[PDB]
Write a protein that binds this DNA or RNA. Sequence first.
RNA 1: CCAUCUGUGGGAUUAUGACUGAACGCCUCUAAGUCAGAAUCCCGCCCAGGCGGAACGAUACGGCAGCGCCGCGGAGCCUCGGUUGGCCUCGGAUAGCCGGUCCCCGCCGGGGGUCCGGUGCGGAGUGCCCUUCGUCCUGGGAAACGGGGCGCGGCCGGAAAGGCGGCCGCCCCCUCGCCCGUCACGCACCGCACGUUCGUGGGGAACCUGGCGCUAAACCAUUCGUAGACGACCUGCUUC
RNA 2: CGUCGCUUUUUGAUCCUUCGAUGUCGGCUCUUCCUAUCAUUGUGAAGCAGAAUUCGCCAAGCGUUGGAUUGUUCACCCACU
RNA 3: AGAACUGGCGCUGCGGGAUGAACCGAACGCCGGGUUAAGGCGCCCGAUGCCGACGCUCAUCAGACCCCAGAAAAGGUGUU
Lengths: 195, 109, 191, 348, 139
Amino acid sequence: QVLVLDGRGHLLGRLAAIVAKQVLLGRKVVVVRCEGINISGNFYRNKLKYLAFLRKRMNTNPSRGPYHFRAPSRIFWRTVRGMLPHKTKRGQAALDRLKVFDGIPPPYDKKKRMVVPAALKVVRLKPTRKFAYLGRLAHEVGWKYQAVTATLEEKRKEKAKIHYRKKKQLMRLRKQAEKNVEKKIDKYTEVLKTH
Amino acid sequence: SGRLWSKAIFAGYKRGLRNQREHTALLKIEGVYARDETEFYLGKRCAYVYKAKNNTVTPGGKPNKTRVIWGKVTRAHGNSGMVRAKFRSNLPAKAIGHRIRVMLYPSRI
Amino acid sequence: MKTILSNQTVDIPENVDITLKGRTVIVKGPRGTLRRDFNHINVELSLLGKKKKRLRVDKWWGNRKELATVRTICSHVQNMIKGVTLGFRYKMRSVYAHFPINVVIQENGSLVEIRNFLGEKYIRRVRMRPGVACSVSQAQKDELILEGNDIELVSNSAALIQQATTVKNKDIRKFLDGIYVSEKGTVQQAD
Amino acid sequence: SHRKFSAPRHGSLGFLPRKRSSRHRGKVKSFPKDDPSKPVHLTAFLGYKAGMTHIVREVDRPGSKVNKKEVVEAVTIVETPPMVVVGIVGYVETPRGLRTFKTVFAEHISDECKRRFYKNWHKSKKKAFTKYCKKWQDEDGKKQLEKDFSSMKKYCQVIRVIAHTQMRLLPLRQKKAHLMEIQVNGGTVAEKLDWARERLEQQVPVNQVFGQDEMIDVIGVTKGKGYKGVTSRWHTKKLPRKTHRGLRKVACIGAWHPARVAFSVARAGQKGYHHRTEINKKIYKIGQGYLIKDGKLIKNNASTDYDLSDKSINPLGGFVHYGEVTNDFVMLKGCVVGTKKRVLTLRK
Amino acid sequence: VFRRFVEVGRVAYVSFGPHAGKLVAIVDVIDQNRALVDGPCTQVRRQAMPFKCMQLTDFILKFPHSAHQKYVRQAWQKADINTKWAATRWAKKIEARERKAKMTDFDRFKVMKAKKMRNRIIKNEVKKLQKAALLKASP
RNA sequence: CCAUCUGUGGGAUUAUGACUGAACGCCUCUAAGUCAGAAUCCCGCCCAGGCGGAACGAUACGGCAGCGCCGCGGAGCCUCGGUUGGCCUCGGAUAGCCGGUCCCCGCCGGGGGUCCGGUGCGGAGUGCCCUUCGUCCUGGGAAACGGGGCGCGGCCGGAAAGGCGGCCGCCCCCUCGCCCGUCACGCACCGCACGUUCGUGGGGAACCUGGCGCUAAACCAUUCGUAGACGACCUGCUUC
RNA sequence: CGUCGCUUUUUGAUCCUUCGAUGUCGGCUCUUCCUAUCAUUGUGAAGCAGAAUUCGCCAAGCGUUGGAUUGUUCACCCACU
RNA sequence: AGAACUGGCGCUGCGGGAUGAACCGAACGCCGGGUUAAGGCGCCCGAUGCCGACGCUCAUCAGACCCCAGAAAAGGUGUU
Ligand SMILES: [Mg+2]
Ligand SMILES: [Mg+2]
């Protein structure tokens, strides 16, 4: 149906290249919490080449021309857009299957979220080399919604403690509930053939 | 009752970079992502099933809006679990990204 | 080159006990407690043995700019051990020509309000890093004392006084006026 | 190449779309942000500029050469009938900006408000808010109306207030109330919201909102000047007399290789009727108008401490193209955006 | 934190490659990423395997620094590495993982029926532990 | 400017000067980690508001007509796509996970000792349904909650885009909603495709068909002149 | 004394495009861009006491005029800055 | 600007060089299956989604593939 990729710990182009391949193959991919996407190289280097992007402005009127987006949901969405054939109708239809959300909205906060170990910083960056966060390089360029997102992030996660608190309570029960067995005739085939 | 076929999406046609060849398709059969494990699917009949607004069946008692384009799996394509299939028409290019239907029929297992 | 490991040790005396949460270091001692995270530096820390209290920092394979930082770890830990038993005391003195520099302490040993620097009417309020203490010295002219546990907060505080007192648009080889650091010692002496 | 003599740009590109505004009443683009340690208060207020006079005041500026002398200064006067609070709007912040949470309007809304909800009041059956007024009295809609202040109090972080002008008290021939939506920037969201439920369908005077010598910002729409050319819209130097086909034109409107007319060049179009916010307009006097009929009518405006006459700020002959001021007024040092008889939002 | 090292005598498991799934005993490290290994009792002889292939276990052997095949063999079966590898929970997981892959179609029926059978018993009994816990807190 | 009025602050930082500090047993602004930092940069203020989204109001009688809302079956028209769902900790990576006695936070949460596991088995290489052909006869094991609901009545949780969910009381009802076994049956269509779902989907047009309710407003025309090339825009038009 | 580059705001060398035609000097008017920085902001160095200057650095945000002669670009002079 | 030798373009499509007269492969009747050359194989874009091997390198202007489309002398207790 729809796959949900949590975006923290991921590199920008390593994640957006895989997402752009899946979206051409018919799937519907939703990249969620794209404030914490990383990008390799230190912060000042990634900050300079984004400011070099901002002055890519057409001279005669900048209203027509390059639309420099500032939220990191649209920083990511534009990176996917350059890895899709978007001037064709095959790639117009591709970018409609991608819905990228900054933060985690309530249709997608109670789903289970997936990661891509191809694009993780821990996997792919050597640990002694520097990386920049997509959140605060969005903050330094005109994205004015960092504080009101990170307030809603810690409101989301405190409610996400109280669910996981009572979910590990329930599996402490059904593992104490299976202490009193009375069913070992059914353990016989599973232990013999991988429980 | 249940699904007697394996899921596969239609990726495109056999192509270089500029020109493409329409007579052979290539498929991403699901769950196989290597060239060593694709040997099961060779020779399998596969189908693209779709809808129209006129009516046709072969046994089905009354013609419905469902119709099909048959074909079969020819060989493997690259190291990464892809598969090329030769149909009997060409795929309409409307089907890029949509699924096809890979059966189990000409089986040696 | 990718060498087989190096290792510095740090002996700890009895009045201070290092516990480690991970690469974080927790140093409790006589005159307080202070902590640093070293979660950016990619090394294993190991305190070994009761009753002797030796810390063993060692880095597996590593290269020459990664081998440079194993000595950097243990010399931040040795300043956390010195600063929690002895403390840090950076005495500093005011150097002045014609104009006496008038330095007062406004908020409880935290803010320093410097006026009459070289005849200027603009006061200079320098707010310090939390953990240091201001003091006009005794039995000595024009001396200021800073006391604290952490060397990077005292010495940064000692630099904000000296940097605010900067002579501008002048020959700075004459006009040698400013409040410069003069001694690097401890709160408790001789331990 | 290289003009041989540098000039600066003619006109500012900060006001580029020299367009008719999409509004007649000035929109507040930004209310002042609050710290909730303050007492609870409104921030803006609607007014009507009536005309201008001038003043004599003993100026006090130590250091200056004007000090302890009398100066004349041009003032405008802005007639302010009191606002009547009608609605309460909540706003919850999203990562897509502020979003309206919900609105609750007054029990019985006035007639000058309901005229604003119609482009043809004469062809109307005046059926607006007939089903909505009943839920204040019907108990089933009322016990959820009290829920939708408790949902308001829990979730939305800034609340505002819908008020309007009492257009019966003006000499204007309009009678539609100007319905504004202004922010209460006081304390916490409980105190901010029970200060607005307390005062639905009640009046708010201007001295409860503003004060004497409390410098504010004036927002309005300018004097519309019509479709004028380059030499009036942008103040470009006229061409010399010998010019064929026209004097009052901008001569070179670009180079060859950008091969397109740039946005930063001057050309003809609509001058005036633009939305502007003036800044730092000091209030000189909050006059109040025409009290009770026992002391048959105290006119008594414009009556300074040194005058002691029975004067009133409506001048001898009435304000030109406005009418005659009978309500409270604000007088402001300096020029103010607008024509006479024009709505303008005074704002902190 | 780094509780198992490479060492002369460290028993490594082999994950992939031409010897995937058989133990080796590390004999000598040669250079930085290649180790000389062998398993004499587990059918893999003396050669140089990469460290990225091998999986370190917690078994050590006291044989000399790069001895012959005999002396490694005597250290292997005195300490009884092949039977102590049977009584570990990590070889029970590779045993269980290959029992599930050779699980036939008829056994996949017999697994299915007894799997839904024991989940009825737990779900009706974990309901009874819910049914008692609310009865603790109602007084 | 030939009269008068107004012109607005924050951030990360450059240059640079430093702090701690190794490499190189000293030293060192740098290598890891920090500090100050500007007519620059970016935002705020200000100007416009997207084939960008909200909240709310009123929602067509008259003389027949007419329109929403719920409960309905009955057909044909078009667009086609899918063939079971996972109902969620934060995160670390030279480290983490589970269970836990004690002393602190309005009968729940913070810490540490201890016991666990760990190429993760309290493992989305996984998990619960399930590969359910149905029914009858007929015995065991398991289970004393019944499970679907057009039910009726209740509460209270989820505002970041809540349109979702949970608990409870009465109820026509089931006592076959599981596993093993005994028994015999239903399209056994005579080897063969698009079968099997989501789905009594999405959009539209009409009718026989139950109740609940509803009775407006835009544009022109006229007027105004805070507005105007023309459109647009701002207004008025009550039998006082 | 050498010697290594850069730039295409000079002049040439070239003759690829244009001969069924690309309106050809200068001034006026107006816009935007570059830095190889005159001034202004922050700095570093002097054979920097102050004052005045010079040499560098981040730096193109913002400014860089009024005239007499000359068709002049250029030049030169007066005056302000 | 002007010669020598050979091949090309002009008269010539096609695969690769993003793009292209002349470069690198290769020359062409209309098709089906197989294989390759030059060139490639993150995603546009067919093919490394190999548990590829070994090192070198951090740039506040990194680097990145014949012709071919940007740099020298000099210098660095930057690392090897
Ligand atoms: Mg705004
Ligand atoms: Mg050749």
